[PDB]
Design an enzyme around this catalytic site. Sequence first.
Site, PDB file in Angstrom:
ATOM      1  N   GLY A  12       7.652  -4.792  -3.866  1.00  0.00           N
ATOM      2  CA  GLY A  12       8.977  -4.441  -3.364  1.00  0.00           C
ATOM      3  C   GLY A  12       8.774  -3.804  -2.012  1.00  0.00           C
ATOM      4  O   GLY A  12       8.930  -2.588  -1.855  1.00  0.00           O
ATOM      5  N   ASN A  13       8.311  -4.640  -1.055  1.00  0.00           N
ATOM      6  CA  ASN A  13       7.939  -4.318   0.326  1.00  0.00           C
ATOM      7  C   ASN A  13       6.633  -3.484   0.437  1.00  0.00           C
ATOM      8  O   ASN A  13       6.137  -3.272   1.551  1.00  0.00           O
ATOM      9  CB  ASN A  13       9.122  -3.764   1.150  1.00  0.00           C
ATOM     10  CG  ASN A  13      10.359  -4.637   1.067  1.00  0.00           C
ATOM     11  OD1 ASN A  13      10.488  -5.651   1.763  1.00  0.00           O
ATOM     12  ND2 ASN A  13      11.276  -4.285   0.176  1.00  0.00           N
ATOM     13  N   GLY A  14       6.067  -3.087  -0.719  1.00  0.00           N
ATOM     14  CA  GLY A  14       4.812  -2.344  -0.808  1.00  0.00           C
ATOM     15  C   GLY A  14       4.626  -1.427  -2.006  1.00  0.00           C
ATOM     16  O   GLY A  14       3.927  -0.415  -1.891  1.00  0.00           O
ATOM     17  N   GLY A  72       1.723  -3.780  -4.864  1.00  0.00           N
ATOM     18  CA  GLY A  72       0.577  -4.336  -4.166  1.00  0.00           C
ATOM     19  C   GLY A  72       0.930  -5.735  -3.694  1.00  0.00           C
ATOM     20  O   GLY A  72       2.071  -5.981  -3.277  1.00  0.00           O
ATOM     21  N   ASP A 100       1.293  -0.107 -18.773  1.00  0.00           N
ATOM     22  CA  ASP A 100       1.970   0.384 -17.569  1.00  0.00           C
ATOM     23  C   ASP A 100       3.480   0.347 -17.622  1.00  0.00           C
ATOM     24  O   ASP A 100       4.128  -0.133 -16.693  1.00  0.00           O
ATOM     25  CB  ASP A 100       1.375  -0.243 -16.282  1.00  0.00           C
ATOM     26  CG  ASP A 100       1.614   0.582 -15.013  1.00  0.00           C
ATOM     27  OD1 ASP A 100       1.984   1.776 -15.133  1.00  0.00           O
ATOM     28  OD2 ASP A 100       1.424   0.033 -13.904  1.00  0.00           O
TER      29      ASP A 100
END
EC number: 2.7.11.1
Length: 275
Positions: free
Chosen positions: A17-19, A22, A129
């Site tokens: 999500g833009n970063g 990953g 996770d």
Amino acid sequence: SSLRDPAGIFELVEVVGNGTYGQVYKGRHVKTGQLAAIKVMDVTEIKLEINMLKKYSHHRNIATYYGAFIKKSDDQLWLVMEFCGAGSITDLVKNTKGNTLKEDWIAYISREILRGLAHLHIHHVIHRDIKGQNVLLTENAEVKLVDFGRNTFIGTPYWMAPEVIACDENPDATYDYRSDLWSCGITAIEMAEGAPPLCDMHPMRALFLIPRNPPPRLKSKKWSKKFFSFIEGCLVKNYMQRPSTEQLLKHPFIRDQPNERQVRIQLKDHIDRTR
Ligand SMILES: Nc1ncnc2ccc(-c3cccc(Cl)c3)cc12
Ligand code: NA
């Protein structure tokens, strides 16, 4: 029998999500325009994981696995899965006035997470996770889990169960299926409060406190008795007395959802209004 090059089948559109995940991209199936999420991995085994991620992803609360591709050169492995267009549960809480979701929305989303987890757990798979960021929404307000199975980084500790954090009496950290249930309870607090417990602590300090602190609790007394009880069930300190996924699916907070129909409608409309 052999993984194909993705050229003309799937194409990368932009990072998601833009970063935050990953090397995960919003992608597209070339011939149909169908969107897809694509995890890009540098590679030098794979085929077995393909067939494995295939079978366990066929459930409605897990993002469906499409296939694996090799981009030739370090070679790139592309893991292709169904795209969920309405962002994560974390995004949903962030884009809500007061950074809090209605109790019936929490009950609906938590049941969908538990259904996804029940499918993985029955098949002896641990998600490892569970968090707001790994629970995605579709435009039709379908709830799907993402990110289940290099390994040099330790991520965020806020959703980690006490047994997963190594300390003197626990030298070998235990990821047990019940560890995902603790993470579901933290995700429910995240939906209720906008952030997980200990969000105001440095990550290393939170990692020290989780095995030592009593179970986290909701800050507000406004919530129903059923919700407090659901949080208590998820957040049993000792995993040995923590209820299983099947037991939590029978908890009244999850089991008894009379406004279910309207919740799905409210969620579908909220997705549109906050897009
Ligand atoms: N399937 C997805 N749809 C939309 N956004 C996404 C964002 C991230 C991910 C995702 C995140 C971590 C690991 C893997 Cl394999 C996939 C999957 C999706
Ligand atoms: Na699926």
